[PDB]
Amino acid sequence: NKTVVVTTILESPYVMMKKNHEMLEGNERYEGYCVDLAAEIAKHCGFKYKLTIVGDGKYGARDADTKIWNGMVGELVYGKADIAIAPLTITLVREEVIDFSKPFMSLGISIMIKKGTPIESAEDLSKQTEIAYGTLDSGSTKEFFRRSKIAVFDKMWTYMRSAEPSVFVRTTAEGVARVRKSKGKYAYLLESTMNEYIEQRKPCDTMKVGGNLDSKGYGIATPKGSSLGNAVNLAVLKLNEQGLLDKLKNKWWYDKGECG
């Protein structure tokens, strides 16, 4: 057996640097839902591991011209990492190049607004131009709008793709900051899981509105043909059935909520 190289991404509250990470080493430098999940998965599958933060800080997309995969998906595809344990959305294009465990968490694209913003749905956003809106610059959310044939979402994509200044952001933190500093003139489309987390964070000035636009899940990913695939999948199912995944979500989302 060899130490398993785990690729993941800095995204709250999945993986975050501990306040005093400078005084720590190895896996101890990080904390979060996926850090806890990695420990449980490794324990149940019987392997030693090393957490690493994805080099380019991306989730995973294929360049239409070079055909090269970036982000965590890329690290798995090219063998730079053995497994990805992060909020990586299970999608068809990814399932074609890597393997996914059954989902360990549910989510859907949602709307985040600065409290008081006169928006209640995606339809509302699409029917007005006063309030700008966008998504994470790369990832499954952006692709959802790019590919959607649903009238409302296609109308939103047409606006976002040519809006200026750009409505796309590099990170969730940037999207949240933009919502918080735009006096209600910017709304952010992001995964419900991140939205729900931020809503319970000071200064408690954001809120999730409307229902989710879709329904999907995050899965643990391995390179196709990996000897870890089967065990990891069974571990996810066992952890869900034992109520551990629900326990972990409450721990990182609500137990220490900062908004009452």
Ligand X SMILES: COc1ccc(C(=O)N2CCCC2=O)cc1
- Which residues of the shown chain bind its own copies in the complex (CB under 8 A)? 90-92, 95-96, 100, 102-103, 106, 144, 147-150, 214-217, 219, 233-234, 237-238, 240-243, 246
Encoded one letter per residue, x for contact with ligand FWD by CB under 6 A and - for no contact, window 160-179 reads ------------x-------
Q: Is 140 annotated as a binding residue?
A: yes
Q: How far is CA 8 from CA 56, 84, 128, 134, 148, in A?
A: 11, 6, 37, 24, 28
Q: Is 118 annotated as a binding residue?
A: no
> Min. distance of Cβ 49 from ligand X in angstroms?
22
* Interaction between residue 103 and ligand X (CB under 6 A): yes
Task: Report the chain's C-alpha Rg in angstroms.
Answer: 19
| Residue in 190, 228, 245, 248 binding ligand FWD, rule: CB under 6 A | 190
- Asked if 229 touches ligand X (CB under 6 A), the answer is no
**Do 54 and 139 contact (CB within 8 A), yes or no?**
no
SS3 250: helix
Q: Which of 88, 125, 198, 209 binds ligand FWD (CB under 6 A)?
A: 88
Q: Are 212 and 110 in contact (CB under 8 A)?
A: yes
229 belongs to the binding site for ligand FWD (CB under 6 A): no
Q: Is 215 in the site for ligand X (CB under 6 A)?
A: yes
Contact 210, 125 (CB under 8 A): no
Query: Of ligand FWD, ligand X, its own copies, none, which one sits near residue 172, judging by CB under 5 to 8 A according to partner kind?
Result: ligand FWD
Window 124-163: residues binding ligand FWD (CB under 6 A): 136, 139-141
Inter-helix orientation angle 229-241/33-45, to 10°: 110
List 209's β-bridge partners, or say none.
111
Euclidean distance between CA atoms 108 and 141, whole angstroms: 9
Please give the Cα distance from 224 to 61 (Å, whole number).
Answer: 17
Among residues 7, 35, 216, 233, which is the contact residue for ligand X, using CB under 6 A? 216
| 143 annotated as belonging to a binding site for a ligand | no
Binding region for ligand FWD (CB under 6 A): 59, 87-89, 136, 139-141, 172, 190-191, 194
